Amino acid sequence: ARYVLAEEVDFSSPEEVKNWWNSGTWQAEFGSPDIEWNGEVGNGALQLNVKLPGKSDWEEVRVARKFERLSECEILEYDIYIPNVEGLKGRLRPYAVLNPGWVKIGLDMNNANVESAEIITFGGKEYRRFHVRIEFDRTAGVKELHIGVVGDHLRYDGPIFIDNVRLYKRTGGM
Numbered sequence: 001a002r003y004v005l006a007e008e009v010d011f012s013s014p015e016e017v018k019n020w021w022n023s024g025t026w027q028a029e030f031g032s033p034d035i036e037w038n039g040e041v042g043n044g045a046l047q048l049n050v051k052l053p054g055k056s057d058w059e060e061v062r063v064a065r066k067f068e069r070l071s072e073c074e075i076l077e078y079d080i081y082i083p084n085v086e087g088l089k090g091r092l093r094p095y096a097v098l099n100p101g102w103v104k105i106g107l108d109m110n111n112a113n114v115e116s117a118e119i120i121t122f123g124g125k126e127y128r129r130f131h132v133r134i135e136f137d138r139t140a141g142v143k144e145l146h147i148g149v150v151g152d153h154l155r156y157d158g159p160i161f162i163d164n165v166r167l168y169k170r171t172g173g174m
């Protein structure tokens, strides 16, 4: 199977951010503002201001966007950036959901320990970098993608950034 990029969001300006919403939390909170554009990170990125208590293994904040072709797609990728503050501990368990249907995709497929992470630099500041790649079946009726940013005993009050959201569909008529 060969795939082509069907949709991509790189967060070029605040105008893209209006397409994203806060779809809720579980054992975690957003700060205020909850979601905003950031023009330094990723040359434009989605900034989630989070408060993860670090007490349990599933501390989730979620953001969502409508994607017209979602029902045609089978691969999602995106990046997560967290400032490289020293001494952070815990694991990320990021995933996604297709809706309607609350179809959970990628559960525990992209888990990462923050104490051994790749780094990327933006404006001379370092960020831990986590890539998320999720394969799923074409799912009838889905119109919304929810990205779930999940901490597991990751005590953190600060910004987490999403960038480079990519959706792929099969090509060649197959």
Ligand SMILES: OC[C@H]1O[C@H](OC[C@H]2O[C@@H](O[C@H]3[C@H](O)[C@H](O)[C@H](O[C@H]4[C@H](O)[C@H](O)[C@H](O[C@H]5[C@H](O)[C@H](O)[C@H](O)O[C@@H]5CO)O[C@@H]4CO)O[C@@H]3CO[C@H]3O[C@H](CO)[C@H](O)[C@H](O)[C@H]3O)[C@@H](O)[C@@H](O)[C@@H]2O[C@@H]2O[C@H](CO)[C@@H](O)[C@H](O)[C@@H]2O)[C@H](O)[C@@H](O)[C@H]1O
Pocket (backbone or CB within 6 Å): 023, 024, 025, 026, 057, 058, 060, 102, 104, 107, 108
């Ligand atoms: O309403 C339909 C739907 O409702 C519930 O699902 C939706 C809610 O999901 C919550 O998040 C879930 C995750 O989706 C996922 O299921 C996760 O599972 C992990 C589990 O907690 C644990 O950490 C586990 O440890 C494993 C591990 O992962 C490995 O596999 C390892 O090898 O082994 C270890 C140990 O075995 O891993 C699991 C992942 O692989 O759990 C979380 C938290 O779920 C708790 O809370 C739920 C709340 O509804 C429910 O009570 C669940 O039973 C319980 O465990 C959240 O995202 C929550 O927000 C979702 O609710 C939706 O929210 C939106 C906004 O309000 C609404 O629109 C929806 O109506 C709904 O409320 C349920 O799980 C489903 O079965 C289904 O019934």
Ligand SMILES: [Ca+2]
Pocket (backbone or CB within 6 Å): 010, 011, 012, 041, 042, 043, 044, 045, 163, 164
């Ligand atoms: Ca970007």
